[PDB]
A paper describes a structure:
Type IV pili (T4P) are functionally versatile filaments widespread in prokaryotes, composed of type IV pilins and assembled by conserved multiprotein machineries. We show that PilB is a modular pilin with a bulky module “grafted” onto a small pilin module, which directly mediates adhesion of S. sanguinis to host cells/proteins. PilB, one of the three minor pilins in S. sanguinis T4P, exhibits a canonical N-terminal class III signal peptide, the defining feature of type IV pilins. The larger size of PilB is due to the presence of a C-terminal domain readily detectable by bioinformatics, which belongs to the von Willebrand factor A–like domain superfamily (InterPro entry IPR036465).
Numbering used by the authors: 43 to 461
Amino acid sequence: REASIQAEMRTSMQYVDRTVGKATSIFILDDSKFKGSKQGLTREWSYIGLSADGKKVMNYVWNKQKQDWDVSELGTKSLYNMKLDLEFKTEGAYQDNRLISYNLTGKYPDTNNKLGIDTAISALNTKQVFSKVAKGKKGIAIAYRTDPIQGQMNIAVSFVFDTSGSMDWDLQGRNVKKTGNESRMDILRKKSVIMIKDLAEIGNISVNLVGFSTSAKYIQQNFSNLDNGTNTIIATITKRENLNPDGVTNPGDGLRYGMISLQSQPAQLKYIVLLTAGIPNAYLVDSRALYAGNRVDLSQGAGRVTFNNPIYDLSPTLGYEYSRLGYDLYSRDSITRENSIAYAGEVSKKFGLGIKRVNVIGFSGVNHEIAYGQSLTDRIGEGGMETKYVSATNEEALQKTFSDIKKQIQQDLWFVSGP
């Protein structure tokens, strides 16, 4: 009657579900983060593992008093010297609950035809569940906590927004006043304020505002922590005087300003949210590029000024001079377009070292005004950081992407904080 050992492993899994249901956060670990005993065990995170030897399902708890783990035997009995194997997986989710699938199996010393409890399914009462297993692992241990992480590293966020003429029109590109619609800038103000409000919910996060047009401008150069009142930023955002559309689209300068402001801050989690609503058509060059017939001035003739051998302005000193500007008001010159994108590429390559991710949002109803958002995002990707491009064609879509960006920020915080 082998039903005894099978029922034993089932009782053990019942104990596991009982303990997991009470957890606020879950993390599936592997051979790296759990090789049995307290080896490599991370502070303040209780576990549930297969026991370094391999036959007693172990449960390590956090004493928090003696600052140590309290080894305990899962359930209360002990099997009859059987070879165990445990494996956890994230099997999707029910309505708003997430499902886990414990899989306990075992064989017996120097024999075959193992025995097992096929695969269970347990729904957790939380949503903060992640997996820290990789490429060829299984997930053999479980990490959790009862009370939330009692405060962790801070986050820095730079909002590089477009403030060009292409932002005064509709989303759908029609006229400003000829239609009863709100300009891209107005809707950006609304959605950005909503983002700011729901962003402070992360806690320990500070955001600054950078605006780019023909050149870049610091709307709020000081990184104000939302924990001390979000109203400090919202005001500057809704301030009717500043932040109005004017000029060509120069993303390189905006990236430079945002990345430098992020490099300054001490938060070990830096992010840049860039919003553009037009094809890139401008860039800034170094004073050196102002040599012989290197600057072709078709400004009054064909409406543009280009540089044959552009030496992009990548100096930490932020300044603007019309004489060092390359642009194409009609955004029809492929040379100026490619150079405007390469400018942001070099800027990201130099000022984007400790940046976690760069979110590029193309906010435009015109199907072609944001045709290079993906290209610009990929170019910025050369800096060696995570880059995500997204297109928002309506107010609802813009709010959806802003909310999703906040969600991803919280997931990176929870993941980085608490393994």
